[PDB]
């Protein structure tokens, strides 16, 4: 997310377009965007097109315009000496697609190769006309869109959704790099600044959870300190753990420690889960998801989150503000946790409502116990307290003495409502977490971990997820193409070291130059047995599953495999919210807004139209009078419900009286005749 933020092209700033005013000619893909701005990975809402992303190979010239590398092709020879062309000069010449079949001899196979002619018109042409060439089939896409495997098999909309989702995956407690990634994951992590790349080659001397100490090849020692369990801008843990031993030798530019979402230096935003593509009893209905309970018991998707609570004691004109332990008009039991200074002892599970920092307000006893407490909907242990004291000549703001701050951390397992999503735009919310017993299990008893509805794939034109599932099965099982008598025809151009792979063999399919369909067919045709000489998944890629709920085998084979899915930062724990009564607004006496200060959901203007259309008059009247801004009405309704008495009658909206006063203030004698 950070790396994509640092490479964003926002067209809306002071001196730039306005979101409300921006039209439809700017919110578009221009043929000059090829290799300079990504035609995918755009905000899905009102910022559709006003916030782009800089492509992978693009760079900015001294003036400010963007340039993209090419590969100067001369006399039909695709020569090196890349030249960074700009858009204007790009128009003049004719660019060639790198996926074009260069025969390693500086000459295309066929004469007709598609090229962006002048004004982004793709056309064929003879090799003499061709002037330049792309660097890679993977140049127009950005850094987060390049991590989608089988991108060319997804439709632009779903690829955009997947690219915008890879930036939302939460760091899981454990990380697992994809079996079927693309390759833009080691560089996307070493160029993001979260993996601690070694400064200079050397030999690790002492490696611990909090410090590596590279003993350089010149007698110098450079200890790398690991930021353990920190808080990111979005409350997500920032674990860094060493991945080297005390005897290893590292090289300059080598990854020496993992980061938040990393596995051996590569981006790992999710986990590899065994997935079935069948509809199942309607629980995975309309984009919902069914998870196995194994993902909850084994912490397969269990993210650590940290919240940052702060409170300060201002000098104020009156003076004497102090963070004291003794809380006026308080109980002893509630004060047990606080330490001598008045700060909770680190390692205590501060549940919602518990005291964190006893603060008194000497309104120069005039001391309100305005103590920082575990806010509404918070929990978890206290992992760190930071207090800055004026007496310690700290750089505090003007007019304070202490700036105590607390961190509460909480491990959130995956539950019903969380928003797992693959890399292809196949987002959904967990509809049910089935127990591991009643799950479709393969012939060998292995229960599938997740079930995805069949009706979501063909409609949305993101078949790339199915290919990812097949190749994930192939990678997990391992394969061995039998070249006993000549290599197979479908594997002639398959690279060596890919004709045989041991189980759990991570592969990569570059974004636009990866695994063809025939190669997937073949690698499914030849896969190793699991433990006994039984192949659980046939050539089609579909297994014969057993319904764990009833026992009978499903009548037809079911597509199974391993798909990489990511836990998005849209957990249900942050969205559930309810109000019976609480804080009310001040000017208009309506309730307050937002989950933070309790707050109440807004009965919008077009939710009054629905009630009026229903003809429900009394419900609308009560909602607008005795629930919102009829103060006497509100209190009497509460008393009526707590007691047994009938619900009272309404009054006058305080909002209407506010409007009357404002209309008078304008200079208009509004009056309510009789």
């Amino acid at each position: 997310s950070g790396l994509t933020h640092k490479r964003r092209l926002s067209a809306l700033g002071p001196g730039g377009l306005s979101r409300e005013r921006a039209g439809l000619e700017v919110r578009d893909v221009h043929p000059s965007h090829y290799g300079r701005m990504c035609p995918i990975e755009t905000p899905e809402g009102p910022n559709i097109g006003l916030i782009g992303s800089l492509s992978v190979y693009a760079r900015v010239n001294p003036f400010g315009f963007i340039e993209t590398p090419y590969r100067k092709v001369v006399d039909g020879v695709v020569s090196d000496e890349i030249v960074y062309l700009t858009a204007d000069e790009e128009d003049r010449h004719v660019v060639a697609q790198a996926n074009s079949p260069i025969d390693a001899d500086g000459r295309f196979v066929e004469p007709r190769v598609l090229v962006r002619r002048k004004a982004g018109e793709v056309e064929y042409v003879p090799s003499s006309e061709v002037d330049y060439m792309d660097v890679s089939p993977r140049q127009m896409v950005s850094v987060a869109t390049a991590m989608i495997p089988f991108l060319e098999h997804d439709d632009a909309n779903r690829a955009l959704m997947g690219a915008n989702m890879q930036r939302q995956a939460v760091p899981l407690v454990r990380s697992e790099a994809p079996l079927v990634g693309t390759g833009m994951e080691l560089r996307a992590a070493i160029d993001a600044g979260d993996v601690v790349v070694a400064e200079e080659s050397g030999v690790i001397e002492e490696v611990s959870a909090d410090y590596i100490t590279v003993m350089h090849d010149n007698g110098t020692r450079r200890t790398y300190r690991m930021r353990k369990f920190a808080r990111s801008n979005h409350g997500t843990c920032a674990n860094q753990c060493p991945i080297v031993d005390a005897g290893d030798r590292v090289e300059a530019g080598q990854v020496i420690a993992d980061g938040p979402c990393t596995d051996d230096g590569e981006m790992a935003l999710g986990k590899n889960l065994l997935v079935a593509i069948m509809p199942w009893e309607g629980h995975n209905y309309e984009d919902a998801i069914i998870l196995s309970n194994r993902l909850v018991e084994e912490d397969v998707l269990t993210s650590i989150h940290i919240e940052e609570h702060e409170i300060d004691a201002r000098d104020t004109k009156l003076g004497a503000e102090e963070i004291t332990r003794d809380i006026p008009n308080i109980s002893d039991e509630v004060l047990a946790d606080l330490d001598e200074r008045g700060i909770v002892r680190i390692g205590a599970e501060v549940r919602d409502g518990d005291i964190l920092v006893g603060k008194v307000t000497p309104k120069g006893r005039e001391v309100r116990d305005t103590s920082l407490k575990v806010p509404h909907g918070e929990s978890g242990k206290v992992i760190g307290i930071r207090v800055f004291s004026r007496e310690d000549e700290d750089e505090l703001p003007a007019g304070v003495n202490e700036l105590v701050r607390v961190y509460v951390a909480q491990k959130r397992k995956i539950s019903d409502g969380d928003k797992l999503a693959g890399r292809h735009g196949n987002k959904g919310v967990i509809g049910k977490i089935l127990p591991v017993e009643d799950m479709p299990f393969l012939a060998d008893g292995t229960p599938v971990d997740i079930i995805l509805n069949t009706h979501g794939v063909p409609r949305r034109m993101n078949i790339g997820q199915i290919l990812e599932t097949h190749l994930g099965w192939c990678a997990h099982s391992g394969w061995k193409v039998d070249a006993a008598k000549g290599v197979p025809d479908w594997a002639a151009r398959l690279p060596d070291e890919l004709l045989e792979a041991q189980p759990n063999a991570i592969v990569s399919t570059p974004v636009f130059d990866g695994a063809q369909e025939a190669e997937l067919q073949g690698l499914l045709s030849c896969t190793l047995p699991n433990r006994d000489g039984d192949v659980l998944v046939d050539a089609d890629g579909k297994a014969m599953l057993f319904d764990g709920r009833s026992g009978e085998p499903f009548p037809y084979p079911v597509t199974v495999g391993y798909m990489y899915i990511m836990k998005l930062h849209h957990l249900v724990d942050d969205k559930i919210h309810a109000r019976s009564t609480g804080p009310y607004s001040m000017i208009t006496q309506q309730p307050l807004g937002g989950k933070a200060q309790f707050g109440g959901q807004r009965f919008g203007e077009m939710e009054c139209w629905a009630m009026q259309a229903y003809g429900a008059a009394y419900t609308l009247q009560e909602l607008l009078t005795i629930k919102s801004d009829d103060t006497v009405g509100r209190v009497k309704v509460y008393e009526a419900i707590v007691k047994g008495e009938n619900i009272p009658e309404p009054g006058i909206p305080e909002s209407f009286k506010v409007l009357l006063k404002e209309l008078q203030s304008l200079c208009l004698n509004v009056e309510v005749l009789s």
Binding site: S136, G253, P495, S508
Partner: peptide, 30 residues
Amino acid sequence: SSSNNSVPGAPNRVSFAKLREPLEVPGLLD
């Protein structure tokens, strides 16, 4: 061939890549 040669501790992640790589991805934060 494989993932890459530029990074020393690159995990052995074999690639289905057919085309070669005339250039390496620049520094992304550059």
